Amino acid sequence: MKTPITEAIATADNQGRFLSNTELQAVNGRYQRATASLTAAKALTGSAQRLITGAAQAVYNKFPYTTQMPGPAYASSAIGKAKCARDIGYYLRMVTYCLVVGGTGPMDEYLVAGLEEINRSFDLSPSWYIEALQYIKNSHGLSGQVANEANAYIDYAINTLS
Amino acid sequence: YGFSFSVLESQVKNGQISIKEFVRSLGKSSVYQKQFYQPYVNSRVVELAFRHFLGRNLSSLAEFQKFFAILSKKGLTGLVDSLINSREYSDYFNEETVPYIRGFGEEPQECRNWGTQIDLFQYSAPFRKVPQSITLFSDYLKALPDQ
Amino acid sequence: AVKQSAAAKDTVETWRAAAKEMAAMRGISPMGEAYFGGIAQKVDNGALAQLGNKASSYKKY
Amino acid sequence: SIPILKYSLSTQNQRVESFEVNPGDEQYRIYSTDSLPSSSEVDQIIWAAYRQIFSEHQILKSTKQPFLESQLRFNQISIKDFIKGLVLSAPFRDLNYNVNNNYRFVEICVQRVLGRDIYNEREKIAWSIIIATQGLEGFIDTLLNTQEYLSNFGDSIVPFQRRRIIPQRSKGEMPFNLKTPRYGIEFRSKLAATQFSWASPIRRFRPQEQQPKAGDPALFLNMVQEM
Amino acid sequence: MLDAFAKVVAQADARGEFLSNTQIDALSKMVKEGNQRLDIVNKVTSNASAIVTNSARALFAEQPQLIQPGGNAYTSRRMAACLRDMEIVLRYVSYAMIAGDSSVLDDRCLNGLRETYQALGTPGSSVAVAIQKMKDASVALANDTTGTPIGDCSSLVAELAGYFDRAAVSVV
Amino acid sequence: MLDAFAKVVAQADARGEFLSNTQIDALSKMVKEGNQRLDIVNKVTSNASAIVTNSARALFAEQPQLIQPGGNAYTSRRMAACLRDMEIVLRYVSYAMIAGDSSVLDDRCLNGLRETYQALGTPGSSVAVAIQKMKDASVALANDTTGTPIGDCSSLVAELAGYFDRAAVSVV
Amino acid sequence: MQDAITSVINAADVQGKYLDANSVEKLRGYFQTGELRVRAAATIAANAATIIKEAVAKSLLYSDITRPGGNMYTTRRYAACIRDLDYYLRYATYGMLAGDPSILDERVLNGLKETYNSLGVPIGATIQAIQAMKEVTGSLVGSDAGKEMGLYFDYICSGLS
Amino acid sequence: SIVTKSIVNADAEARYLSPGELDRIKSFVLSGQRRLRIAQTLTENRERIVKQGGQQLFQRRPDVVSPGGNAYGEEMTATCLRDLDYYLRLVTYGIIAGDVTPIEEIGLVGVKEMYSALGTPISGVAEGIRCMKDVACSLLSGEDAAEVGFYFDYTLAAMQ
Amino acid sequence: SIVTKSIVNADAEARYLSPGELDRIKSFVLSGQRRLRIAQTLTENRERIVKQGGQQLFQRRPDVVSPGGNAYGEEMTATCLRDLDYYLRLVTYGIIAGDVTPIEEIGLVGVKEMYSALGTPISGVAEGIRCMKDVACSLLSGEDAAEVGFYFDYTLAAMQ
Ligand SMILES: *CC[C@H]1/C(=C/c2[nH]c(/C=C3N=C(/C=C4\NC(=O)C(CC)=C4C)C(C)=C\3CCC(=O)O)c(CCC(=O)O)c2C)NC(=O)[C@@H]1C
Ligand SMILES: *CC[C@H]1/C(=C/c2[nH]c(/C=C3N=C(/C=C4\NC(=O)C(CC)=C4C)C(C)=C\3CCC(=O)O)c(CCC(=O)O)c2C)NC(=O)[C@@H]1C
Ligand SMILES: *CC[C@H]1/C(=C/c2[nH]c(/C=C3N=C(/C=C4\NC(=O)C(CC)=C4C)C(C)=C\3CCC(=O)O)c(CCC(=O)O)c2C)NC(=O)[C@@H]1C
Ligand SMILES: *[C@H](C)[C@H]1/C(=C/c2[nH]c(/C=C3N=C(/C=C4\NC(=O)C(CC)=C4C)C(C)=C\3CCC(=O)O)c(CCC(=O)O)c2C)NC(=O)[C@@H]1C
Ligand SMILES: C=CC1=C(C)[C@@H](Cc2[nH]c(/C=C3N=C(/C=C4\NC(=O)[C@H](C)[C@H]4CC)C(C)=C\3CCC(=O)O)c(CCC(=O)O)c2C)NC1=O
Ligand SMILES: C=CC1=C(C)[C@@H](Cc2[nH]c(/C=C3N=C(/C=C4\NC(=O)[C@H](C)[C@H]4CC)C(C)=C\3CCC(=O)O)c(CCC(=O)O)c2C)NC1=O
Ligand SMILES: CCC1=C(C)/C(=C/C2=NC(=C\c3[nH]c(/C=C4\NC(=O)[C@H](C)[C@H]4CC)c(C)c3CCC(=O)O)/C(CCC(=O)O)=C2C)NC1=O
Ligand SMILES: CCC1=C(C)/C(=C/C2=NC(=C\c3[nH]c(/C=C4\NC(=O)[C@H](C)[C@H]4CC)c(C)c3CCC(=O)O)/C(CCC(=O)O)=C2C)NC1=O
Ligand SMILES: CCC1=C(C)/C(=C/C2=NC(=C\c3[nH]c(/C=C4\NC(=O)[C@H](C)[C@H]4CC)c(C)c3CCC(=O)O)/C(CCC(=O)O)=C2C)NC1=O
Ligand SMILES: CCC1=C(C)/C(=C/C2=NC(=C\c3[nH]c(/C=C4\NC(=O)[C@H](C)[C@H]4CC)c(C)c3CCC(=O)O)/C(CCC(=O)O)=C2C)NC1=O
Secondary structure: OOOHHHHHOOOHHHHOOOOOOOOHHHHHHHHHOOOOOHHHHHHHHHOHHHHHHHHHHHHHHHOOOOOOOOOOOOOOOHHHHHHHHHHHHHHHHHHHHHHHHOOOHHHHHHHHOOOHHHHOOOOOOHHHHHHHHHHHHOOOOOOOHHHHHHHHHHHHHHHHHO | OOOOOHHHHHHHHOOOOOHHHHHHHHHOOHHHHHHHOOOOOHHHHHHHHHHHHOOOOOOOOHHHHHHHHHHHHHHHHHHHHHHHOOHHHHHHOOOOOOOOOOOOOOOOOOOOOHHHHHHHOOOOHHHOOOOOHHHHHHHOOOOOOOO | OOOOOOOOOOOOOOOOOOOOOOOOOOOOOOOOOOOOOOOOOOOOOOOOOOOOOOHHHHOOO | OOOOOOOOOOOOOOOOOOOOOOOOOOOOOOOEOOOOOOOOOOHHHHHHHHHHHOOOOOOOOOOOOHHHHHHHHOOOOOOHHHHHHHHOOHHHHHHHOOOOOHHHHHHHHHHOOOOOOOOOHHHHHHHOHHHHHOOOHHHHOOOOOOHHHHOOOOOOEOOOOOOOOOOOOOOOOOOOOOOOOOOOHHHHOOOOOOOOOOOOOOOOOOOHHHOOOOOOHHHOHHHHOOO | OOOOOHHHHHHHHHHOOOOOOOOHHHHHHHHHOOOOOHHHHHHHHHOHHHHHHHHHHHHHHHOHHHOOOOOOOOOHHHHHHHHHHHHHHHHHHHHHHHHOOOOOHHHHOOOOOOHHHHHHOOOHHHHHHHHHHHHHHHHHHOOOOOOOOOOOOHHHHHHHHHHHHHHHHOOO | OOOHHHHHHHHHHOOOOOOOHHHHHHHHHHHHOHHHHHHHHHHHOOOHHHHHHHHHHHHOOOOOOOOOOOOOOOOHHHHHHHHHHHHHHHHHHHHHHHHOOOOOHHHHOOOOOHHHHHHHOOOOOOOHHHHHHHHHHHHHHHOOOOOOOOOOOHHHHHHHHHHHOOOOOOOO | OOOHHHHHHHHHHHOOOOOOHHHHHHHHHHHHOHHHHHHHHHHHHHOHHHHHHHHHHHHOOOOOOOOOOOOOOOHHHHHHHHHHHHHHHHHHHHHHHHOOOHHHHHHHHOOOHHHHHHHOOOHHHHHHHHHHHHHHHHHHHOHHHHHHHHHHHHHHHHHHO | OHHHHHHHHHHHOOOOOOHHHHHHHHHHHHOHHHHHHHHHHHHOOHHHHHHHHHHHHHHHOOOOOOEOEOOOHHHHHHHHHHHHHHHHHHHHHHHHHOOOHHHHOOOOOOHHHHHHHOOOOHHHHHHHHHHHHHHHHOOOOHHHHHHHHHHHHHHHHHOO | OHHHHHHHHHHHOOOOOOHHHHHHHHHHHHOHHHHHHHHHHHHOOHHHHHHHHHHHHHHHOOOOOOEOEOOOHHHHHHHHHHHHHHHHHHHHHHHHHOOOHHHHOOOOOOHHHHHHHOOOOHHHHHHHHHHHHHHHHOOOOHHHHHHHHHHHHHHHHHOO
């Protein structure tokens, strides 16, 4: 995963050099912004079941065909609505994994790479998940730079789908 | 084999019954008779009883016929109760001492069942399905056999 | 016996300061995770069973 | 300044010649930029470069290199500069370089780049200090300036597995993507606590008394169907 | 690589005799069936991406632990690799259908596929489940009598079924 | 490559949950010792070539049969290789000290290293004592208090010790 | 049931003579290895279950004696094996301490091959289990101690043959 | 079976069989038509009873199949289901014998010594048989499910 | 202890103690000074020997602490370490008694019945004691580590 630590290590064995002070400052700036990051990942984990079931309902209010179309790709079954709710469980879990390590490493490894090939093979529209993520982005209730860190990894998940 | 007599280890560890009681109930158990009673003959069952509940082989011929007729008429529950209720059990083991095998260097042995008793005090004992002692004590009197 | 009550009679009390912070790793917010290599093995997420207690744990009083 | 460890060669198929004038069917398709391709036929080279240097898996949308693709189409860089951009690509680091050591990564960058097998195990020892001293970007240009790369690929050919099959035959050797996967048995077995903990699902239930024993004629029914 | 005619030529090339006049009648029976062969292949190559995703979806309901967190085909990096892995098997099965003999199936696909699932840790019994999911979709689409004359094609769908359960026993 | 933060995340995603509440407090414990984690590495790279040449001379105060004619580290290509391998091992343990766990140490350096030296003929345990001549040249160099103020930091130098003897048993 | 000292005393007594230089010469040879045998018998007592688990899995775990019809099929029959292999690893430990294999044929070997033929126990698979059990025992106690413990295993295998 | 141990019971007691013993050998052989139907149901449902048996076993005990579990990998998981095919077979014997005597001396006597000596969690294999029981009793009516389930739980009892 | 069972051995045999028995009671009491030092090391290292003992136990057996494991949550994990404090205590008794007789009738006799009846994986608690053994023998010299480790592996043997 690409953290700010593991990219400072990565430029060192690029050249095969030792760890100088052109990489200690990269880890130093990570430790500054990790105190406004783990206060954000704590609050998203604490209100996770409020955010997930509120974001499934924001998709169903905007796209009411998905609750009533027959077929396997839609959440009109009992098992269609469970597969929808664990998908927004997966999108919130990779945001709090990315806030902990301080970079887009976990959602590059687990969400982003290979996403187009499974949304095309299983007929999942990528505008469903932007509406599930736009509900989270202005109703987590955070305030300040703790809000400014959650609105950079939710917005990174949107720009992959957008 | 993970066998268990929890009731008997109960009533003996508390002292509610003797070792002799625990030994007699072991003899009338069904895990015993499936082991040393079903696969054998009443002839061979009598000798295998003596190795277990008396720690010695049969001694004479009349000691066979007294204990074969008992097993002949009352089965396993009549035979083991007739060994545990004898005097020879009580003289060696009364109520507290588990029966041992009265080996060669234990006791003044007798010349008459020398070979057989040394055979009986071996692990190979439970596979001589033919009775070793009732034939040997009877050929002592009859003439030489044909072989 | 009343001078030794409630602290030294509880043998599980001495490790509550550590087994309470050893067990604060990878919390699960919805229902479903601890998938453990791809099986279900879910959660209870209540107030009781997040402490691991059962019906035999309040009935012990 | 520390030359390489002088290893030894072995017996292989690529260091002899074939006597194959007009080669028939198992030719491995020289995609090249001297045949002057059209814009739909530059695209059949870029897929062959992605299939050679990655596997057939990592030709995903995130693993494509859309700025390196455009500089090939403008004839700014060559094929030899395009293969060098693919090993130094950030998808090739986190998928094929973080999950094996330096002695297995040399087995990847000689099977895929040079198109030959490794000679013996000393060559993996003799090459793995180049990655740990001056880096992966110092490892590829000393592997792309070898005479084995220039004398049959040059500056315009996407590489390929040279002489995989014997011309009268039909079996041959194993393809190199099916020879060396993304990770091996030695990286998978050590991580069975954090990662790679899967436990295996149930097989189809075969009863035990239907299995063949020595001297059963059911152990020769696959021989009889190859008659 | 051989076709069906190449295995009769290269067999008697090792014996070294001319091809007999009763062997020409077996090769001429093949070219009478040569155009019923070409719409078994056209039926399965046209519904190719729906044989794959309807068989994966049937697999992941029977064995749900392959896609659950901590499973083998869990993430979006590896769902795509599992979906690719049945596209490659369906590719080489249709290659060995148009050639008549399986000499390209077990050469570029099955040549060591079992030994790289032990190295990757992929359950090889589950890949042989999802191949028999694809066999049941492909022989039902080769019985489709639309846009084609009616006739008996039972001996050629039984050959397409032979290359499906050859690639299933070569991964377990 | 995983640092100390990614090893918590990769164990929780395999199970599939988010981070706990004590869950960062122990990671928030790591960042208030962040300057103390960093300036240890500001010693051990800024005196790094001193640690090589002091230990490499003092190894042949202990085992001078390596520099013997016929010995392993005899020749000038092989003396340049023995200072090479002790420079690499010191480089990776500085990478693990800025990470927080040894995952970059045993994926780059120590994985498959015993089987190199046995195929090379290099004595296995005789390079492990060269690593232990670099630890006491560095953990005494970490306890030196030039420029920095005074606080109890024996917990971090045990981990700096803890990489040097994890690496020592991987070459024996 | 004689150890090395008992056998030395018996042979020196059976001729009615004292313990001369040759009799004490072997006794000194036994006391020199007295330190090795206890540590050999020490680790074998610790890893008794582990050694037997290693031998059966390495010799006869998956062979068709393990499958139905084989000589080891039922759970009573399988459980008799590890009970049976425990004696071989145990009595061999006694011979290793006593330095004399007299206890083996006294308490193990006599009526043994005649018993397995009665039950129909395969003597061939039995010896290979003991051979594999001898192989793992050389792992624990070392080379020379394995040479000592191994010297009584094949004594069982020889007589049991 | 009920016939062989009703004999060896009266055998040991030096007597013949009572009406209590002979009105049940009689009652068992008239029951024999219904027993073969029940065993015939489990005979060619072993594909679904075993494979769904190991279904719930891994969902309830992922440790045994996870890396480090005893049944880890393609190999052990196949043998992981092999034992369930064994115990499902012995239950078919017990149903036809009208007793756990076939299950007793096969797969039950000394079973803890085997599985302890194989490193297998004996509690885990007990969980496997319980998962097979719910699949088996789901294949039969209520009158039969009181029998087919009845032999499984005896195997559950002796296996712990 | 060695004193009490060397007595009850010679007690049953109707005899006194041989030189083989009395030269070892003698040899054991001169060993008593060194035994108390060894037990004194483990006595006030229980904070590290137990807490690092459960360290490797969870890293090697995450199932038992994961949701569904027997030691799941703040509660069971505390008791999860409580048993290790028990068994670490009994090893201190065995070292001073010179035998596993204290460990035998406490924590070993019928231990499989308890842990099977508690739902705890008995193999899991065996893994816990092995993790404590590496921590314990790392605290002592080679001459001592052949003893302190020696009593753990006996507990490992009887616990499976
Ligand atoms: C509420 C969302 C809408 C919706 C969802 C829906 N999704 C699926 C199926 C899948 N989704 C994924 C996606 C991921 N898997 C991952 O591991 C990750 C990274 C952590 C992602 C993003 C995959 C692989 C599938 C297929 C397998 C599966 O989980 O079953 C389905 C089922 C469709 C099918 O054909 O099986 C639904 C219904 N659908 C809606 O209607 C909601 C609007
Ligand atoms: C009278 C000769 C006998 C014979 C020869 C024969 N050999 C081959 C094939 C190969 N030989 C090699 C060996 C080398 N190749 C090299 O480049 C080097 C230098 C390092 C060596 C030592 C190799 C690699 C092959 C296979 C590739 C090739 O075709 O060159 C063959 C060909 C087999 C075929 O059917 O194609 C023959 C016939 N065989 C005999 O019967 C004679 C006794
Ligand atoms: C639903 C499928 C099951 C599954 C599949 C799975 N497979 C892989 C990876 C590979 N498969 C191959 C095999 C081939 N590759 C080829 O190019 C060819 C033709 C020449 C064959 C026969 C190889 C080489 C790989 C490695 C990468 C690749 O090329 O695809 C993976 C990904 C491994 C990873 O961890 O990244 C998956 C997930 N796994 C399952 O769970 C299903 C049972
Ligand atoms: C020196 C104090 C000791 C010693 C060193 C020695 N090493 C080599 C050769 C090699 N060492 C490696 C090791 C690595 N390569 C890596 O990339 C990494 C990081 C992943 C490590 C740890 C390798 C691959 C070689 C062989 C290639 C080479 O020549 O460097 C030698 C030379 C052997 C030769 O014959 O050239 C020497 C002398 N040997 C000693 O005696 C000291 C104990
Ligand atoms: C390149 C494209 C290409 C094709 C798609 C085929 C298409 C095709 N098939 C047939 C001809 C035929 N096609 C079929 C096929 C079928 N009947 C069935 O019931 C099955 C559903 C199905 C195949 C499985 C049969 C049976 C005949 C021959 C008619 C007969 O002999 O009864 C013919 C007529 C040939 C002739 O008149 O001699 C053609 C053009 N050939 C091609 O060259
Ligand atoms: C470029 C890398 C880099 C660093 C190393 C630190 C350097 C540094 N360290 C400290 C601050 C400190 N640094 C140390 C560390 C030590 N003190 C000792 O006596 C030991 C020798 C050593 C640890 C082994 C301690 C203990 C403090 C806190 C001072 C205190 O305890 O009051 C401070 C003051 C503000 C702060 O706490 O961050 C700074 C700038 N910052 C950086 O940007
Ligand atoms: C079939 C009728 C019957 C019963 C009931 C019976 C009981 C019985 N219970 C015993 C012991 C025991 N019983 C207990 C029981 C308990 N401890 C508690 O705190 C609880 C209140 C209780 C469990 C419910 C304990 C701990 C012992 C061991 C006592 C000791 O070692 O001193 C013993 C001593 C021997 C032994 O267990 O082996 C007997 C004989 N015997 C019988 O024949
Ligand atoms: C101390 C000297 C000594 C020995 C060795 C000994 C052996 C002995 N082994 C026996 C059985 C057995 N032994 C085995 C052993 C095996 N099956 C195999 O396939 C393997 C080759 C082998 C394990 C290595 C089996 C399966 C039985 C049970 C036979 C039956 O139930 O018919 C029996 C029958 C009674 C019983 O086990 O309770 C005895 C007496 N007795 C002794 O006094
Ligand atoms: C008819 C009565 C009967 C039984 C039950 C039996 C069991 C038996 N189970 C075995 C192995 C095995 N059994 C398992 C079982 C399991 N792993 C798990 O995680 C689960 C908890 C459990 C299955 C539900 C495993 C993993 C092995 C292989 C162990 C190894 O390879 O070391 C073996 C050795 C290999 C073989 O010969 O098959 C036997 C003999 N034999 C019998 O005659
Ligand atoms: C001195 C010998 C001795 C032992 C060993 C002992 C054990 C013992 N363990 C218990 C519980 C327990 N033990 C565990 C243990 C574990 N969970 C895991 O995952 C691990 C594998 C394992 C520990 C390493 C758990 C979770 C409980 C609580 C079970 C429940 O609440 O249902 C209990 C019931 C509660 C109590 O009174 O403490 C006893 C009596 N008692 C003794 O006298």
